[PDB]
Homo-oligomer: A and B are copies of this chain.
Amino acid sequence: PLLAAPLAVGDTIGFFSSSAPATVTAKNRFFRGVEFLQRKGFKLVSGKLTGKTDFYRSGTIKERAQEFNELVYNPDITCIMSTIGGDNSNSLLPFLDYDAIIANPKIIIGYADTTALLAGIYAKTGLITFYGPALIPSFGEHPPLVDITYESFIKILTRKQSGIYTYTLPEKWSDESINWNENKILRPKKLYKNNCAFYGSGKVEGRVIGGNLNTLTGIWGSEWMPEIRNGDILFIEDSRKSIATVERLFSMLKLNRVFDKVSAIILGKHELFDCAGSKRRPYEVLTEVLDGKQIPVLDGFDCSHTHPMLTLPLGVKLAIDFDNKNISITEQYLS
């Protein structure tokens, strides 16, 4: 695979808004995120659509593609980071400068709607991109949870590329829709004990592929959707969905023969899942959809819309040990 240069303290991070104009609509949280990374020693370059609104988006399709491309053209930038997701990153894909991405590999990081770009860029270039922090939701998060997010971010991207990396398990997590865009918290978020579950036995090692499942529907079937192959580990997460939507998305994967191919599934913790009173969790729905197909599942990986968030390279080998209840990166993912 194509590998970007590793991150280092003091590096320059460029940020872009490929969908929702949250540098305006969540400006307080944006400013907190900016200050957080600056105090860590990072220099920041603001994408050209920062501070702009086109109602539901930051700008036209072409303007958003231009914003991203301009960061790729900047030789000082080591990391290109999403400000926030939304709905509309998939629009940009025909207009990204893939040749420039190949010529100037950088750490591309974000999540949620930005999946369209992360997966699309991988499909076109083979570049290992990252499911991880977006500036506003991730680094604008109030303490204590932001520190755990940052610890993973800095560890994954700066560590020496020798031997496997085994993920730490966040001690506590939350998904509460409070403390979004103000100077002070209303009150502390509920801190849940980590209820991540490993369904299965032994160890499964394979290339990880996926991201935000709902977002994948926007690139599905196209040349920008990476081919899922036999032995892959499927990584999927969703946010604030009804159980109805979750069944729909799981069945989509089934119809596409994904469950005939994958060796394991990682479900990211689902932010504020709406069970419609059924008290069912996504894993139970997946089990029905699977129709007896035995696939080991890591249910509740902390790489999703919940806080804190871990950083995950996409398109490289992971090993999930279902007996020892851990997950590791086993393939080099930065130069």
- B255 and A224: CB pair below 8 A? yes
Q: How far is the CA of A91 from the CA of B217 in the complex (A)?
A: 16
B87 touches A248 (CB 8 A): yes
CB distance from A305 to the nearest CB of B (A): 17
Q: How far is the CA of A291 from the CA of B93 in the complex (A)?
A: 13
> With contacts A56-B242, A56-B278, A61-B288 known, is A88 near B248, CB below 8 A?
yes
8 Å CB contact of A90 from B222, B225, B248: B248
Is the Cβ of B86 less than 8 Å from the Cβ of A252? no
Count this chain's copies in the assembly: 2
Knowing A220-B217, A247-B87 touch, does A55 contact B252 (C-beta < 8 A)?
Answer: no
Query: Is A244 located at the chain interface by the 8 A CB criterion?
Result: yes
CA–CA, A61 and B56, complex, Å? 36
Interchain nearest-CB distance for A115 vs B (Å): 12
Known contacts A56-B243, A277-B55: does B90 contact A255 (CB below 8 Å)? yes
* Interface residue A51 (Cβ < 8 Å from any Cβ of B): no
Interface size on A, residues (CB 8 A): 43
**Choice from B55, B225, B244, B278 contacting A243 with Cβ under 8 Å:** B55
Q: Which residues of B contact A54 (CB under 8 A)?
A: 278
A91 with B247: in contact, given A221-B220, A278-B55, A289-B61 (CB under 8 Å)?
A: yes
Q: Of residues 107 to 159 in A, which have CB atoms within 8 Å of B's CB atoms?
A: none
Task: State A252–B54 Cα separation when bound (angstroms).
Answer: 21
Q: Judging by beta carbons under 8 Å apart, are A289 and B91 in contact?
A: yes
Report if A251-B288 is in contact (Cβ < 8 Å); known contacts: A217-B217, A278-B56: no
Question: What are the residues of chain B within 8 A of A168 when measuring CB–CB?
Answer: none
A205-263 interface (Cβ within 8 A of B): 217-225, 242-245, 247-249, 251-252, 254-257
For residue A60, which residues in chain B have a CB less than 8 angstroms away from its CB? 288
- The 9 A-B residue pairs with the shortest CB-CB distance, nearest first, are A222-B255, A87-B244, A56-B276, A217-B217, A221-B221, A55-B278, A91-B251, A56-B244, A55-B276
A contacts, CB < 8 Å to B = 19, 54-57, 60-61, 86-88, 90-91, 93-94, 217-225, 242-245, 247-249, 251-252, 254-257, 275-278, 288-289, 291
